[PDB]
Amino acid sequence: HNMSVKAMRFPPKSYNKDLESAEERREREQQDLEFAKEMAEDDDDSFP
Amino acid sequence: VIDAFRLINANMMVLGHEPRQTTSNLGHLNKPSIQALIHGLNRHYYSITINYRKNELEQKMLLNLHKKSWMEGLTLQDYSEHCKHNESVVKEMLELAKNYNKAVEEEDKMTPEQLAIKNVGKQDPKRHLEEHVDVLMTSNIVQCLAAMLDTVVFK
């Protein structure tokens, strides 16, 4: 049970070789939605 | 959650010191209170920042939560209370086992989207054989050492 996890380690490693910080344009699109949301709530407040 | 606030002279803001209520604070951004913080942070008050002072004497005080010189290791549960525990678990092992075979035949003949959304009766999979073995074991191992240790300690 220590042995076969210690060899199971390698399959996860090939996947980590695949990006695990990818889809940065999704996150940048969300960030461009939080500037529209921030001001959506200053306009639902209706307060400057 | 704990903030701090200080009102700001709204009059002086109207008079042109509106960009002059900026004292030099650091920052970290808030939102859900933008309700009254859009004229709060930016008209009526602002955000102070909070810290703490973790003394070492207070830390060595709170750190206390167990007086064990009569707890475990000088005790151990009842050995007829402890067999009635094993009985129950190691029977539940059987019940779960069967369903486990029936899951290993299924997963083989299906694609991971249908085993993904499989959230009806979580009693079937690994999750419960692990959930068990780590309570069972624990128990028992130590269940285990407690008896031995006392045999020498109070020899």
Added chain:
Amino acid sequence: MPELAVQKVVVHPLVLLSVVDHFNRIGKVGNQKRVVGVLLGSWQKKVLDVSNSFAVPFDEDDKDDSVWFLDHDYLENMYGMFKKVNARERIVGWYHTGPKLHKNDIAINELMKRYCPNSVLVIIDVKPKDLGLPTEAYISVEEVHDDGTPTSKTFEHVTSEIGAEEAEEVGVEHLLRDIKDTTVGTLSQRITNQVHGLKGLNSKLLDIRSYLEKVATGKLPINHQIIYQLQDVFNLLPDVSLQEFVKAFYLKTNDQMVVVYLASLIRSVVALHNLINNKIANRDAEKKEGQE
């Protein structure tokens, strides 16, 4: 007490912090001194849940024992000040900053008792050092003795510990993210309990050994009672039923392994099936790694 109206004294963390803050309020050149406050709390069974406390101006001669001063008027003002803020806050006792008991204590116990019968002391420490809790609870009882000596106000020990609320919980939680104690999982947590327990037995016994050695030589008049109890101790040690006990203990262990065996085995099979899952996911990831 003989009365089942006291037993588990449970002090919430903010009190501990409160007496440890009080010990530095006075702390100028008046430090190195017993400081005393009153314990506010609630209770309704075998408990004395302590919650709030506030220093009471207190002085005490450093060589005499009948020269102690305690502004009880201050009490009859503040007690009401805090009642006016929280109902259900009677005076359930009073705390005394250790390091241990003083002859004078019993005297105090009767100028605090003029408020609430059952009042208890709660010796709290101003120095972390003990490995058990820094919270010992005593009651002022009285008894008769087989030797025929006049009745006395002694002090009797009652079990103690600290508890918490959601509030308390969370504040403490917040204050110990520096000294993390959660990285440690279950199994090891309880092994810790069983080594740290011996760390208690060891020093308790050690203290009795220093006492016995103290009366035998470097004389300190014998108190027959201590030695009495100390005999029950050596009769209770597990010994006389040696052979049979052996043959049984071995058997119960045997069972224990049988079930450990099963546990570790299932654990193994499950982990291995996990591995098969990794290998197959790797093959099908290798068909994708090709393509275009």
Added chain:
Amino acid sequence: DKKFHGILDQGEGVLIIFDEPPVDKTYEAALETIQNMSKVVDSLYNKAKKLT
């Protein structure tokens, strides 16, 4: 017919009645789960033969 766990003795006529304790289930069960776990392992073998 198992109605009182004894042993009759001829030549002296003594009807010995030894007391017998019950066969603990903590084993019988584990016999059954080891038993079952095999079946698992087999089917798991066939899942092994497919990926590789």
Added chain:
Amino acid sequence: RGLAVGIALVMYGRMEEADALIESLCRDKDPILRRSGMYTVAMAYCGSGNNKAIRRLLHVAVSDVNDDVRRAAVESLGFILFRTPEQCPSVVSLLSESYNPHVRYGAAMALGICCAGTGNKEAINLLEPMTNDPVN
């Protein structure tokens, strides 16, 4: 803070003048005397292998909400790896991906300083996806 900076700025290899005190410096619950308590080590061992003194300050720097140890434990690397501005991409990479905004910042000033003299593009390919991290 202005005394911490004044103890740090005066070491250029004279070695343990306040480092011998590091077992107490880095033992004060104060943040000024732990940050200083690693700056002085930053500047007296410039151009050599100070490995053990960023490591002790990642598992504990994530416990001291004070970035006084998060920012500096990493902005350290910006000097001890000034010598060779081309091992820096290989050991702050483990360190920008990791969560903890403070750590990112520190790694970005660990690159800003030392891989500016060579302007190496293994620093830049790593710097761009840090420019896109959300926290302002």
